[PDB]
Amino acid sequence: CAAPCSCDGDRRVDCSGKGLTAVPEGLSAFTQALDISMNNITQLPEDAFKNFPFLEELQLAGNDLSFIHPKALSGLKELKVLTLQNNQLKTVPSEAIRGLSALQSLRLDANHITSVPEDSFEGLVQLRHLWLDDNSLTEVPVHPLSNLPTLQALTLALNKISSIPDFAFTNLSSLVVLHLHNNKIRSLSQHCFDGLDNLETLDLNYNNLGEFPQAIKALPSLKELGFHSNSISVIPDGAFDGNPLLRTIHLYDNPLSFVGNSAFHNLSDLHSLVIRGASMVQQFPNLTGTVHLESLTLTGTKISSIPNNLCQEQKMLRTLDLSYNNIRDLPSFNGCHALEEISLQRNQIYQIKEGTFQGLISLRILDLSRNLIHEIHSRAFATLGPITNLDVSFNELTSFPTEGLNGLNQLKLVGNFKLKEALAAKDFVNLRSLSVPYAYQCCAFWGCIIHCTPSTGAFKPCEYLLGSWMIRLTVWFIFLVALFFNLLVILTTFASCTSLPSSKLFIGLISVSNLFMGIYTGILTFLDAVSWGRFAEFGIWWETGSGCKVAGFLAVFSSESAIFLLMLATVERSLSAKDIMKNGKSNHLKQFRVAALLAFLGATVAGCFPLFHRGEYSASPLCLPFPTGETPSLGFTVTLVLLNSLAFLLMAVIYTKLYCNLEKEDLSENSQSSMIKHVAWLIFTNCIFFCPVAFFSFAPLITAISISPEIMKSVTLIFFPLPACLNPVLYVFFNPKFKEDWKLLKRRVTKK
Ligand SMILES: *[C@@H]1O[C@H](CO)[C@@H](O)[C@H](O)[C@H]1NC(C)=O
Ligand SMILES: *[C@@H]1O[C@H](CO)[C@@H](O)[C@H](O)[C@H]1NC(C)=O
Ligand SMILES: *[C@@H]1O[C@H](CO)[C@@H](O)[C@H](O)[C@H]1NC(C)=O
Ligand SMILES: *[C@@H]1O[C@H](CO)[C@@H](O)[C@H](O)[C@H]1NC(C)=O
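Above: the input record for the complex with 2-acetamido-2-deoxy-beta-D-glucopyranose. Below: its predicted structure, written as tokens.
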């Protein structure tokens, strides 16, 4: 073949991508096809193809062509395919292409053409396909297109066409497919499409059609119609009367609000129908004379009733979607043997009867989430086929049938807060994914393969409430010591019918306050003993029942009142000490008693606060407010922990102020030295035992520290109730005054 390009036999020359600026020479006149694309031929001289009389296929892609001689293409009587894409013609070379009698395919896209001469395309009696996209056309060339009776495919995409007048294609009797997508069409005249009796495919996507066109009524042979991504809002009745042969309708991405009831009648071959956002539709459409729907979708409407004949008329219905509507009752689905997917989420369905899903033998996915369902017949799913995915989440369910669900794979139950029963593992042997309203229902299918959610962490144990043996014995040790010692201390102080000083007074209520904490641990110990190895059964009942709220109230009330009381004792000790060298007598005894009642009131208010909020006490089976995986209490928990910690410093620095103001020689023999030293230990142990609880509560706010859940659980069971038992222990063994009171009690007991 002639240099620098190659000849692919069969009278074919591949001479493209060589940067040639002119028609190559040396090629035989017997050549049938020439491809010289990707070159730099910008101007074509006259008779540039003189010595190729038998050329049938000519390609001129990407040549930066600007000017063509009118007689340049003379003698190409056998030319059939002519491509001129990616050039700068800016106008259709009507004079150059006048003599192409046998031309069949003309490609003129991507040429920045802004206008077309009226005499263009004359002599193109053999044309079948014409490409005119990617240009700057502003009007439909009615007259130039009127001279192509044999045209079959016409593309005018990606242009600036604004409107189409009447009878624009009144000659294209042989047209088959017409493309007009990605244009600026905003108005279609009534008779713009007249004469296109042979048209089959029409594309009107990405336009500005504000009203449904009535001109499509004159297209009896239409098969594919697409006008999606437009401004059409209303589709009136009788729109598709003149086109009985559609197969696919594209109308998505439209401001569709109202649809004619009858509009989609007698649409044979209609294989799909998807309508979304039609908020004004209130009645189910007629879908009559249409028995070949494969997929149906009606979302965002006001439909409240579904006709019974839906499963008696539709034959090849495969997928059904009616979500986002006002459907309240469900008709019998018997007959829809080809149905596979049903989506009915976000409706007003309240019950499921036995006959609702009798006839579905090929159902695989069934969605009923976010409804008002409160009862389901036990045999509703009995007569089902290969059901694979089921979703009835966010409902008012109280029970759940299991018959016929052995083949289930995905199941969602979240939001059914009134559902208490635990699902049996033997009824869902093929389960792989499961979500349940309460984590305690995931204990059967831990997954030891079954991503059960929410995960049953250490905070929500399945086997044992307390967990390890070491933890359990300590809580028993704490409970017995707190109950026995606090009762003893309470009795001795209040059994002496003598004058009660303020310093002795605050000791008593601290023991009383710590007694309730011992009671709180008693509830946990007995609950653990009863639910030994079977806590998952009682988990739901305990948290949701009033038992958790009562136990949770005691823990908050006993803990908060303990800090407030001993803080008052610190203030009392400082004030009583000051009055010694100043006045020598304390006369605030009545005032302190009032503050003690006020101190208890503050604890009661704090204890009752989580009761008003829903689920704050139910976050953990321990009934303790903690930020771990709980926000309702996150705002509440921080308030308490800062309040307790804040109270520490003011009651601490006053002791240092008292200690500094107290001379070292005043503690030698004064009876106040023992009293001041006893509190000095209470401020110590209570402070250190509160930091681990306090600092773990700050852990969720610090993302840089990841603490595994079981660690918080162990310390909270060993440190939070620890001060309750330790406070009386120090008093009985280390306070010399208690021994004197013990002597007084023994004498009264012996006397009585
Ligand atoms: C094609 O060749 C001409 C020769 O004058 C040159 O001016 C032009 O830049 C070339 N085009 C490309 C794309 O190389
Ligand atoms: C082509 O269109 C012109 C103008 O509408 C008309 O006069 C002529 O008869 C048409 N030829 C046909 C329809 O074959
Ligand atoms: C469907 O076509 C039949 C036969 O032409 C006609 O009788 C019937 O009324 C049509 N459907 C509608 C739109 O009612
Ligand atoms: C469906 O079309 C038939 C045509 O005869 C009509 O009688 C019927 O009322 C229509 N139904 C609805 C609800 O559009």
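Notes for the reader.
The longest helix spans residues 546-582.
Residues 396 and 564 are 44 Å apart (CA to CA).
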